[PDB]
Design a protein around this ligand. Structure first.
Ligand code: A1BRK
Ligand code: ZN
Length: 140
């Protein structure tokens, strides 16, 4: 579990969005596993606008932040689960790091800000949904 709070927006994994997030929907993309909802309170996270490939992510299954090297956002094949059939998820970045079911929503950060959130994983890999191309998160 976990979310990004920037401006008047709440960014979450689409598969973990609540019925309230859908009522307050701003934008969603099933192919990216992302959902953005509106908030009454202003958030304090800053989104990174860079091409960094190294950062630090939060791993809830270990209660630890780990430094990682990660790939550029790409179309990556993800196995079927209770949330989606087998498909390609877009804007996904992979790293060698621990993750287990329950870890989605952990923040990946670099020196410039929030890069993304955990969205996939398995076999000593962890996948992050990139948010650095969503330039509109900085305005209105
Ligand atoms: N983006 C998706 O399709 C997710 C939806 C939930 C399921 N999913 C996973 O990969 C779940 C997973 C499995 N093994 C290790 C780590 C994980 C976790 F980090 F929690 F994602 C795909
Ligand atoms: Zn950066």
């Amino acid at each position: 579990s976990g979310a990004i709070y920037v401006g008047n927006y709440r960014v979450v994994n689409r598969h973990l969005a609540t019925h309230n997030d859908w009522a307050n929907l701003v934008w969603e993309d099933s192919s990216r596993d992302l959902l953005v909802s509106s908030t009454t309170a202003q958030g304090c996270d800053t989104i990174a606008r860079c091409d960094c490939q190294t950062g630090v992510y939060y791993c809830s299954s270990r209660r630890k932040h780990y430094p990682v090297s990660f790939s550029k956002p790409s179309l990556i094949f993800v196995e079927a689960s209770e949330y989606y059939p087998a498909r390609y998820q877009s804007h996904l970045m992979l790293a060698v790091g621990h993750s287990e079911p329950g870890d989605c929503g952990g923040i990946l950060r670099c020196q410039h800000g929030v890069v993304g959130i955990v969205s996939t994983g398995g076999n000593g890999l962890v996948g992050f949904a990139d948010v650095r191309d969503l330039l509109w998160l900085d305005e209105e």
